[PDB]
PDB file of C-alpha atoms in Angstrom:
ATOM      1  CA  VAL C 207     -20.700 181.460 -61.782  1.00 51.25           C
ATOM      2  CA  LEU C 208     -20.271 177.840 -59.671  1.00 54.62           C
ATOM      3  CA  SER C 209     -23.349 176.022 -59.191  1.00 53.55           C
ATOM      4  CA  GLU C 210     -24.895 175.379 -55.578  1.00 55.59           C
ATOM      5  CA  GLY C 211     -23.380 171.868 -55.938  1.00 57.29           C
ATOM      6  CA  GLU C 212     -19.970 172.756 -57.058  1.00 54.92           C
ATOM      7  CA  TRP C 213     -19.724 175.266 -53.955  1.00 52.62           C
ATOM      8  CA  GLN C 214     -20.601 172.759 -51.746  1.00 52.16           C
ATOM      9  CA  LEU C 215     -17.908 170.270 -53.222  1.00 54.80           C
ATOM     10  CA  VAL C 216     -15.573 173.238 -52.527  1.00 54.63           C
ATOM     11  CA  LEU C 217     -16.762 174.341 -49.006  1.00 50.95           C
ATOM     12  CA  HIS C 218     -16.676 170.286 -47.925  1.00 49.34           C
ATOM     13  CA  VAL C 219     -12.974 170.304 -48.848  1.00 47.77           C
ATOM     14  CA  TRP C 220     -12.001 173.811 -46.979  1.00 48.88           C
ATOM     15  CA  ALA C 221     -13.927 172.335 -44.074  1.00 49.47           C
ATOM     16  CA  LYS C 222     -11.327 169.776 -43.878  1.00 48.15           C
ATOM     17  CA  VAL C 223      -8.053 172.585 -44.618  1.00 48.17           C
ATOM     18  CA  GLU C 224      -9.552 174.277 -41.775  1.00 49.38           C
ATOM     19  CA  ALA C 225      -8.711 171.740 -38.970  1.00 50.63           C
ATOM     20  CA  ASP C 226      -5.014 172.145 -39.355  1.00 54.30           C
ATOM     21  CA  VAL C 227      -4.811 175.313 -41.356  1.00 55.95           C
ATOM     22  CA  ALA C 228      -1.238 175.836 -40.136  1.00 53.53           C
ATOM     23  CA  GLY C 229      -0.399 172.525 -41.892  1.00 53.43           C
ATOM     24  CA  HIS C 230      -1.828 173.266 -44.899  1.00 52.61           C
ATOM     25  CA  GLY C 231      -0.386 176.820 -44.964  1.00 51.81           C
ATOM     26  CA  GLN C 232       3.324 175.116 -44.726  1.00 52.60           C
ATOM     27  CA  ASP C 233       2.208 172.491 -47.119  1.00 53.63           C
ATOM     28  CA  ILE C 234       0.962 175.278 -49.619  1.00 55.02           C
ATOM     29  CA  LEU C 235       3.842 177.819 -49.356  1.00 55.99           C
ATOM     30  CA  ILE C 236       6.776 174.894 -49.576  1.00 57.23           C
ATOM     31  CA  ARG C 237       5.416 173.992 -52.404  1.00 58.47           C
ATOM     32  CA  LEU C 238       4.546 177.023 -54.572  1.00 57.71           C
ATOM     33  CA  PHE C 239       8.262 178.267 -53.307  1.00 54.52           C
ATOM     34  CA  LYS C 240       9.876 175.220 -54.389  1.00 54.66           C
ATOM     35  CA  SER C 241       7.706 174.635 -57.494  1.00 57.97           C
ATOM     36  CA  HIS C 242       8.093 178.510 -58.520  1.00 56.78           C
ATOM     37  CA  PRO C 243      11.038 179.911 -56.973  1.00 54.76           C
ATOM     38  CA  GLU C 244      10.480 183.113 -58.224  1.00 56.96           C
ATOM     39  CA  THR C 245       7.600 183.723 -56.077  1.00 55.84           C
ATOM     40  CA  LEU C 246       9.922 183.405 -52.875  1.00 53.25           C
ATOM     41  CA  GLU C 247      12.141 186.233 -53.954  1.00 52.45           C
ATOM     42  CA  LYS C 248       8.911 188.736 -53.783  1.00 50.61           C
ATOM     43  CA  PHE C 249       8.808 187.980 -49.903  1.00 50.95           C
ATOM     44  CA  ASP C 250      11.728 189.721 -48.288  1.00 51.35           C
ATOM     45  CA  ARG C 251      10.778 187.764 -44.664  1.00 48.91           C
ATOM     46  CA  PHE C 252      11.605 184.298 -46.659  1.00 47.71           C
ATOM     47  CA  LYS C 253      14.276 185.149 -49.548  1.00 47.45           C
ATOM     48  CA  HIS C 254      16.870 183.546 -46.604  1.00 45.90           C
ATOM     49  CA  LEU C 255      15.526 180.108 -46.710  1.00 43.24           C
ATOM     50  CA  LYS C 256      17.318 178.043 -49.399  1.00 40.10           C
ATOM     51  CA  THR C 257      16.268 174.532 -48.446  1.00 39.88           C
ATOM     52  CA  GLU C 258      12.844 172.828 -47.741  1.00 39.51           C
ATOM     53  CA  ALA C 259      13.963 171.848 -44.493  1.00 38.96           C
ATOM     54  CA  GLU C 260      14.538 175.473 -43.769  1.00 40.31           C
ATOM     55  CA  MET C 261      11.306 176.147 -44.747  1.00 39.98           C
ATOM     56  CA  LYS C 262       9.550 173.558 -42.881  1.00 39.73           C
ATOM     57  CA  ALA C 263      11.663 174.752 -39.499  1.00 40.49           C
ATOM     58  CA  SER C 264      10.148 178.284 -40.024  1.00 42.79           C
ATOM     59  CA  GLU C 265       7.514 179.485 -37.437  1.00 42.32           C
ATOM     60  CA  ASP C 266       7.149 182.447 -38.993  1.00 43.08           C
ATOM     61  CA  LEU C 267       6.411 180.642 -42.703  1.00 42.94           C
ATOM     62  CA  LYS C 268       3.771 178.509 -40.783  1.00 42.19           C
ATOM     63  CA  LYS C 269       2.454 181.795 -39.219  1.00 42.61           C
ATOM     64  CA  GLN C 270       2.015 183.396 -42.985  1.00 40.65           C
ATOM     65  CA  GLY C 271       0.379 180.474 -44.200  1.00 42.59           C
ATOM     66  CA  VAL C 272      -2.435 180.945 -41.793  1.00 41.49           C
ATOM     67  CA  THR C 273      -2.490 184.369 -43.094  1.00 44.03           C
ATOM     68  CA  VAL C 274      -3.001 183.446 -46.855  1.00 45.14           C
ATOM     69  CA  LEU C 275      -5.333 180.322 -45.800  1.00 44.91           C
ATOM     70  CA  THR C 276      -7.895 182.573 -43.898  1.00 47.19           C
ATOM     71  CA  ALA C 277      -8.322 185.430 -46.093  1.00 47.96           C
ATOM     72  CA  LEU C 278      -8.790 182.796 -48.827  1.00 46.94           C
ATOM     73  CA  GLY C 279     -11.598 180.980 -46.878  1.00 46.87           C
ATOM     74  CA  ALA C 280     -13.030 183.931 -46.048  1.00 45.54           C
ATOM     75  CA  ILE C 281     -13.256 184.637 -49.729  1.00 45.90           C
ATOM     76  CA  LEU C 282     -14.503 181.056 -50.640  1.00 47.63           C
ATOM     77  CA  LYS C 283     -17.557 180.909 -47.933  1.00 44.02           C
ATOM     78  CA  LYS C 284     -18.643 184.245 -50.028  1.00 41.83           C
ATOM     79  CA  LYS C 285     -19.578 181.632 -52.804  1.00 44.75           C
ATOM     80  CA  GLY C 286     -18.434 184.451 -55.507  1.00 42.88           C
ATOM     81  CA  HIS C 287     -19.588 187.545 -53.564  1.00 44.83           C
ATOM     82  CA  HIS C 288     -16.187 188.241 -52.305  1.00 44.22           C
ATOM     83  CA  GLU C 289     -16.189 192.322 -53.767  1.00 44.87           C
ATOM     84  CA  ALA C 290     -15.297 193.852 -50.278  1.00 44.76           C
ATOM     85  CA  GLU C 291     -12.534 190.946 -49.819  1.00 44.95           C
ATOM     86  CA  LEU C 292     -10.928 191.162 -53.224  1.00 48.19           C
ATOM     87  CA  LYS C 293     -10.746 195.218 -53.359  1.00 53.10           C
ATOM     88  CA  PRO C 294      -7.686 195.664 -50.716  1.00 52.11           C
ATOM     89  CA  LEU C 295      -6.250 192.091 -52.047  1.00 51.06           C
ATOM     90  CA  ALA C 296      -6.403 193.397 -55.438  1.00 51.48           C
ATOM     91  CA  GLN C 297      -5.007 197.144 -54.112  1.00 54.43           C
ATOM     92  CA  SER C 298      -2.253 195.902 -51.880  1.00 53.36           C
ATOM     93  CA  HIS C 299      -0.606 193.228 -54.696  1.00 50.07           C
ATOM     94  CA  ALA C 300      -1.095 195.083 -57.405  1.00 54.31           C
ATOM     95  CA  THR C 301       0.619 198.331 -56.037  1.00 53.33           C
ATOM     96  CA  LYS C 302       2.832 197.333 -52.657  1.00 55.00           C
ATOM     97  CA  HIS C 303       3.598 193.390 -53.267  1.00 54.00           C
ATOM     98  CA  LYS C 304       4.092 193.260 -57.105  1.00 54.07           C
ATOM     99  CA  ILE C 305       2.677 190.153 -57.610  1.00 51.18           C
ATOM    100  CA  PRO C 306       1.637 189.093 -60.985  1.00 50.07           C
ATOM    101  CA  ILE C 307      -1.810 187.433 -61.487  1.00 53.31           C
ATOM    102  CA  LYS C 308       0.146 184.425 -62.899  1.00 54.15           C
ATOM    103  CA  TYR C 309       1.727 184.033 -59.549  1.00 53.20           C
ATOM    104  CA  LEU C 310      -2.049 183.509 -58.478  1.00 55.14           C
ATOM    105  CA  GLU C 311      -2.050 180.637 -60.782  1.00 55.48           C
ATOM    106  CA  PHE C 312       0.909 179.060 -59.042  1.00 58.81           C
ATOM    107  CA  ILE C 313      -0.132 179.164 -55.885  1.00 54.03           C
ATOM    108  CA  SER C 314      -3.841 177.581 -57.133  1.00 53.17           C
ATOM    109  CA  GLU C 315      -1.562 174.537 -58.404  1.00 51.84           C
ATOM    110  CA  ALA C 316       0.079 174.522 -55.113  1.00 52.57           C
ATOM    111  CA  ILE C 317      -3.363 174.592 -53.243  1.00 53.00           C
ATOM    112  CA  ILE C 318      -5.095 172.071 -55.373  1.00 53.31           C
ATOM    113  CA  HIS C 319      -1.809 169.576 -55.247  1.00 50.45           C
ATOM    114  CA  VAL C 320      -2.091 169.714 -51.562  1.00 48.84           C
ATOM    115  CA  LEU C 321      -5.952 169.380 -51.249  1.00 52.17           C
ATOM    116  CA  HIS C 322      -5.125 166.276 -53.000  1.00 54.55           C
ATOM    117  CA  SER C 323      -2.622 165.023 -51.240  1.00 52.98           C
ATOM    118  CA  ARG C 324      -4.439 165.301 -47.573  1.00 51.46           C
ATOM    119  CA  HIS C 325      -8.023 164.725 -48.669  1.00 50.65           C
ATOM    120  CA  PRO C 326      -8.110 162.210 -51.710  1.00 51.71           C
ATOM    121  CA  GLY C 327     -11.476 160.751 -50.563  1.00 51.20           C
ATOM    122  CA  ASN C 328     -13.119 164.288 -50.199  1.00 50.72           C
ATOM    123  CA  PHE C 329     -11.054 165.484 -53.173  1.00 51.22           C
ATOM    124  CA  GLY C 330     -11.981 163.490 -56.157  1.00 49.75           C
ATOM    125  CA  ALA C 331     -11.835 165.188 -59.804  1.00 45.38           C
ATOM    126  CA  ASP C 332     -15.366 166.791 -59.666  1.00 46.67           C
ATOM    127  CA  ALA C 333     -14.317 168.590 -56.123  1.00 47.41           C
ATOM    128  CA  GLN C 334     -10.611 169.382 -57.655  1.00 43.26           C
ATOM    129  CA  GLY C 335     -13.104 170.964 -60.740  1.00 44.07           C
ATOM    130  CA  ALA C 336     -15.240 172.661 -58.602  1.00 41.74           C
ATOM    131  CA  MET C 337     -12.203 174.130 -56.709  1.00 40.90           C
ATOM    132  CA  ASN C 338     -10.305 175.095 -59.970  1.00 43.08           C
ATOM    133  CA  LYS C 339     -13.432 176.900 -60.927  1.00 40.12           C
ATOM    134  CA  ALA C 340     -13.323 178.945 -57.775  1.00 37.76           C
ATOM    135  CA  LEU C 341     -10.020 179.955 -57.777  1.00 35.76           C
ATOM    136  CA  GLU C 342     -10.326 181.005 -61.709  1.00 36.73           C
ATOM    137  CA  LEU C 343     -13.378 183.130 -60.644  1.00 38.47           C
ATOM    138  CA  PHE C 344     -11.116 184.846 -57.976  1.00 37.14           C
ATOM    139  CA  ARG C 345      -7.991 185.145 -60.378  1.00 37.06           C
ATOM    140  CA  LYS C 346     -10.520 186.716 -62.959  1.00 38.39           C
ATOM    141  CA  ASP C 347     -11.865 188.978 -60.524  1.00 39.07           C
ATOM    142  CA  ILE C 348      -8.768 190.202 -59.062  1.00 36.23           C
ATOM    143  CA  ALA C 349      -7.097 190.128 -62.604  1.00 35.14           C
ATOM    144  CA  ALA C 350      -9.846 193.434 -63.348  1.00 35.31           C
ATOM    145  CA  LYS C 351      -8.959 195.183 -60.580  1.00 33.63           C
ATOM    146  CA  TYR C 352      -5.180 194.610 -61.654  1.00 36.53           C
ATOM    147  CA  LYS C 353      -6.467 196.002 -65.344  1.00 38.18           C
ATOM    148  CA  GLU C 354      -8.336 199.091 -64.038  1.00 37.07           C
ATOM    149  CA  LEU C 355      -5.119 199.972 -62.004  1.00 37.83           C
ATOM    150  CA  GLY C 356      -3.032 199.549 -64.934  1.00 39.10           C
ATOM    151  CA  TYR C 357      -0.871 196.433 -63.899  1.00 36.15           C
TER     152      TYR C 357
END
């Protein structure tokens, strides 16, 4: 469980991401796809993208970044009471998209990298620790639903 103080650090930084959800989404997805190319392969919609400049130029990539960041924003703002949010996300990612839990780790690292890049003064080590705890809690609860479904 996160403390109230940890939730605060998390949501203070997230309120900043929310000033430019599109920009953050693009940076995070590009980070993820460059750092972990296997992840790009899960997206039929992006597998034609072969360079960072192609990725940066993709309007659909930006749009999908807003999708992922909007769903995550909603989960974070539940401060751990995110059962209603995770159930559908767990079902589709396990059974339809085939996303290993390890890839949720990868996107967490990309999120942390970018937040650090864009918000140094509001994302010191304390806020980074809180963000990684929140993202781990998310992964933990998703993993439990994966294990239930046999994935």
